[PDB]
Design a binder for these strands. Structure first.
Ligand SMILES: Nc1nc2c(ncn2[C@@H]2O[C@H](COP(=O)(O)OP(=O)(O)OP(=O)(O)O)[C@@H](O)[C@H]2O)c(=O)[nH]1
Ligand SMILES: N[C@@H](Cc1ccccc1)C(=O)O
Ligand SMILES: CSCC[C@H](NC=O)C(=O)O
Ligand SMILES: [Mg+2]
Ligand SMILES: [Mg+2]
Ligand SMILES: [Mg+2]
Ligand SMILES: [Mg+2]
Ligand SMILES: [Mg+2]
Ligand SMILES: [Mg+2]
Ligand SMILES: [Mg+2]
Ligand SMILES: [Mg+2]
Ligand SMILES: [Mg+2]
Ligand SMILES: [Mg+2]
Ligand SMILES: [Mg+2]
Ligand SMILES: [Mg+2]
Ligand SMILES: [Mg+2]
Ligand SMILES: [Mg+2]
Ligand SMILES: [Mg+2]
Ligand SMILES: [Mg+2]
Ligand SMILES: [Mg+2]
Ligand SMILES: [Mg+2]
Ligand SMILES: [Mg+2]
Ligand SMILES: [Mg+2]
Ligand SMILES: [Mg+2]
Ligand SMILES: [Mg+2]
Ligand SMILES: [Mg+2]
Length: 393
RNA sequence: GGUUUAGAACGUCGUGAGACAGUUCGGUCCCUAUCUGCCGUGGGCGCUGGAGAACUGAGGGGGGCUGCUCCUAGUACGAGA
């Protein structure tokens, strides 16, 4: 919090997706040291991407860490996802703000169950674009074996409804690029080119009023409570009235500084991850799931009608009927919440793979409007996508 | 230290002397090694003329224990941990 962030080069939210222990987090560490050395940005290291006791004694990542690497054309902002089966909830917050992912499948193991589960969550939430990266390569010195894995990833993406064959598959070791190998340094410089070429300039909404979902709350020693997250729409000026709506109730507030990776800002525009500092709020009372809206724009609701599209076995979901009293998890912008289902009259049962409308009473109120997209999940897997129809409360 | 002598007391049994795998406090542990054995250390003669060395090695005898940490490799094995 000292240097002013100059608004030059378009902002893009990138992040690594893939299987457990697959060079997902190590790729992010390779991207920093490669781009910092040649172009001449800020250095950083692989340690700062994941410290704590939880990501050292174990080794695995839980928290969605963030990184800022700059290139001549654009200014990227990384989101390193966790990857494991237990950490799907805090991943979806990292994956929702991500515009164009970098998928991570490896040349020794290949596509494994989580890779299918990750890309499934990317479609229903919001992941337009995706780039493959083979994160081992050197361990198996062979031309025939390494290229057989490329075929199966093209099959996976195309089977699940992505381009597949059009996606630029890249090969390169992360640990070799970390030290200083001229061939492998240049091969991950090539990935920075593939991010620039394939992913276009993202479409933001800097017109309709301010909204910002809170991904992770902080308490800065000196300033007060800081909320992070991508600004979904509108803008944020310093010393402007902001209403925090969602779980519990609703509180008034005012912004006292917006920032971009420990650098000051005047206007926090849409489509970019920013840390908003709120005035006169405690760490405990403000929680994860609430949204920073402009006063009057949005209202918290505990009941709503919604056109729910339930999935079948082929698309990946439930395979049995259910009656009123069923309680699955509804993932709106960031957080999840449980809610009882009340079906319409003249509908005895809800079969899998069917379009119907239904009233859903949530246990916690969340800020919502008509035409909001969500993805229902239960039992460590997906259930059904849909849209909000009418407000009731 | 315990149990097992003489003192004393408690509970208990006995009219009592006393008694109790009931308890409680106090209460002499000798031996200079002949033989066998064993550990060492010599004298004597023998080994075929004597003497000084150096050995071979039949046959004994000691010795023989394991831990972590790193590397292999977060590799194989596992959705994962
Ligand atoms: N040979 C090789 N090993 C790698 C590479 N990248 C990572 N590793 C190994 O895997 C670990 C790196 O963590 P990754 O699993 O790649 O990334 P991650 O985000 O921690 O993975 P998740 O647990 O899924 O979050 C290190 O301990 C490395 O030993 C690579 O490019 N080549
Ligand atoms: N926009 C934030 C992203 C972030 C969130 C949480 C921790 C670190 C970084 C910067 O800084
Ligand atoms: C003078 S009481 C003696 C007790 C006896 N001692 C040795 O045999 C026991 O047995
Ligand atoms: Mg990860
Ligand atoms: Mg006060
Ligand atoms: Mg005694
Ligand atoms: Mg005694
Ligand atoms: Mg007596
Ligand atoms: Mg007796
Ligand atoms: Mg007795
Ligand atoms: Mg005693
Ligand atoms: Mg005495
Ligand atoms: Mg004595
Ligand atoms: Mg004698
Ligand atoms: Mg003797
Ligand atoms: Mg002897
Ligand atoms: Mg003789
Ligand atoms: Mg002789
Ligand atoms: Mg002879
Ligand atoms: Mg011998
Ligand atoms: Mg003999
Ligand atoms: Mg022996
Ligand atoms: Mg040993
Ligand atoms: Mg190691
Ligand atoms: Mg190891
Ligand atoms: Mg591991």
């Amino acid at each position: 919090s000292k240097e002013k962030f100059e608004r030059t080069k378009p902002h893009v939210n990138v992040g690594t997706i893939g299987h457990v222990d697959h060079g997902k987090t190590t790729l992010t560490a390779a991207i920093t040291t490669v781009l910092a050395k040649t172009y001449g940005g800020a250095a950083r290291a692989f340690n700062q991407i994941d410290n704590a006791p939880e990501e050292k004694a174990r080794g695995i990542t839980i928290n969605t860490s963030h990184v800022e690497y700059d290139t001549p054309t654009r200014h990227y902002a990384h989101v390193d996802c966790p990857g494991a089966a237990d950490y799907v909830k805090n991943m979806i917050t990292g994956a929702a703000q991500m515009d164009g992912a970098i998928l991570v499948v490896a040349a020794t193991d290949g596509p494994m169950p989580q890779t299918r589960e990750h890309i499934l969550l990317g479609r229903q939430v919001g992941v337009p674009y995706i780039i493959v990266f083979l994160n081992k390569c050197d361990m198996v010195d062979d031309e025939e074996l390494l290229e057989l894995v490329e075929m199966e990833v093209r099959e996976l993406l195309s089977q699940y409804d992505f381009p597949g064959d059009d996606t630029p598959i890249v090969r390169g070791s992360a640990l070799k690029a970390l030290e200083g190998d001229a061939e492998w340094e240049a091969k991950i410089l090539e990935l920075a080119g593939f991010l620039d070429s394939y992913i276009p300039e993202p479409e933001r909404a800097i017109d309709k009023p301010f909204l910002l979902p809170i991904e992770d709350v902080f308490s800065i020693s000196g300033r007060g409570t800081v909320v992070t997250g991508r600004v979904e729409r509108g803008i944020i000026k310093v010393g402007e009235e902001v209403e925090i709506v969602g779980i519990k109730e609703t509180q008034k507030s005012t912004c006292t500084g917006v920032e971009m990776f420990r650098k000051l800002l005047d206007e926090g525009r849409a489509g970019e991850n920013v840390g908003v500092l709120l005035r006169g709020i405690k760490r405990e009372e403000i929680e994860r799931g609430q949204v920073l809206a402009k006063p009057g724009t949005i209202k918290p609701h505990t009941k709503f009608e919604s056109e729910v599209y339930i999935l079948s076995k082929d698309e990946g979901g439930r395979h049995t009927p259910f009656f009123k009293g069923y309680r699955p998890q509804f993932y709106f912008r960031t957080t999840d919440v449980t809610g009882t289902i009340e079906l319409p009259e003249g509908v005895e049962m809800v079969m899998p793979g069917d379009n119907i409308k239904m009233v859903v009473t949530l246990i916690h109120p969340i800020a919502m409007d008509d035409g909001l997209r969500f993805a229902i999940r239960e039992g460590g897997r997906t259930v059904g996508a849909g849209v909000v129809a009418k407000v009731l409360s």
